[model samples]
Target: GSSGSSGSLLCGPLRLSESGETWSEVWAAIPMSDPQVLHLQGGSQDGRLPRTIPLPSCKLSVPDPEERLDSGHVWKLQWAKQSWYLSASSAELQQQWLETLSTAAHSGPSSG
Candidate 1:
């Protein structure tokens, strides 16, 4: 799970280890920060770090476990939308996205 507010985002990629191999599940998280690096701990005696490849131009955001909402808090309808999360400083990613939106805009029904 993942969520973000303002400039902070948390993404968590689920991982599992079995039979001397590690497998990653679905990566669901907002790209809050870029290039989050993790150092592997433990050793061959305990367990070695699994060989894993990083996703291309990606970041992970995890959800907070402490926040809660009351039943009567209610919510107001504003606008329906979806957001694409990406690296803050990745020029390539930004250009790709801009091209995609440009194409979509030109392909709209009203365009002639």
Candidate 2:
């Protein structure tokens, strides 16, 4: 349900703004799930979906070696979505992802 990449896909910090004049607070906790798909369709001030990115499915679990340290086992799913209005330091990546989110918000996705 979040987006950020070091050098590819998404680059730089994920910055958001509610009014587009001020950066909104951005925070995403590691979710707990498997093969979870997130559909973020609400970012625009006027009921719209600005961006959506199909994230690579991944699993996060407690280390096996420390599984018996009296700590409870915790599992989680990690995914990222390319943000639309979210600004990026990288101009190229920004252009690519921005367009995607903008189109989706303006119209919709190609799939149901």
Candidate 3:
């Protein structure tokens, strides 16, 4: 089950507050066949992700310059039912992720 280009991103995970009752580690993957679809996995056993979600249908917000400095270039992803705050180790990685996701979301599926 593959299509376009496969890639992985290493970054810190988003956590929910006590009121929300949640905690997790962030690891994401992009399959070549569906570039715009982001597969998100949290801490799991056997080194396999337990959950996967497509990001294209979600809403994304870019961080302001000041916030980026304090937060290591973080970005927010939101869906009607859920939301997450993800960060990259550096500014460059943040830009790269943003570009890749944007392209994937807009690009059509690869032709067979």
lDDT of each: 0.28, 0.34, 0.53
Off by over 4 Å in 2: 1-12, 25-85, 103-112
| Tens digits of per-residue lDDT for model 1, 89-108 | 23343344334333332344
lDDT, candidate 3, 1-109, per-residue tens: 1133334432233332111223345565665555557666555422332244466576667656654233556676666566666666567667767777766556566
* Candidate 2 least-lDDT 10 residues: 27-36
Best by TM-score: 3
Clashes of each: 6, 1, 5
Clashes of 2: 1
Selected candidate, larger lDDT, 1 vs 2: 2
| Model 2 lDDT per residue over 27-89, tens place | 221222311222333333443333423433322222343433221221222334322334444
Q: Using lDDT, give the best candidate's number.
A: 3
Best first by lDDT, ranked: 3, 2, 1
Model 1, position 33: C-alpha lDDT score: 38
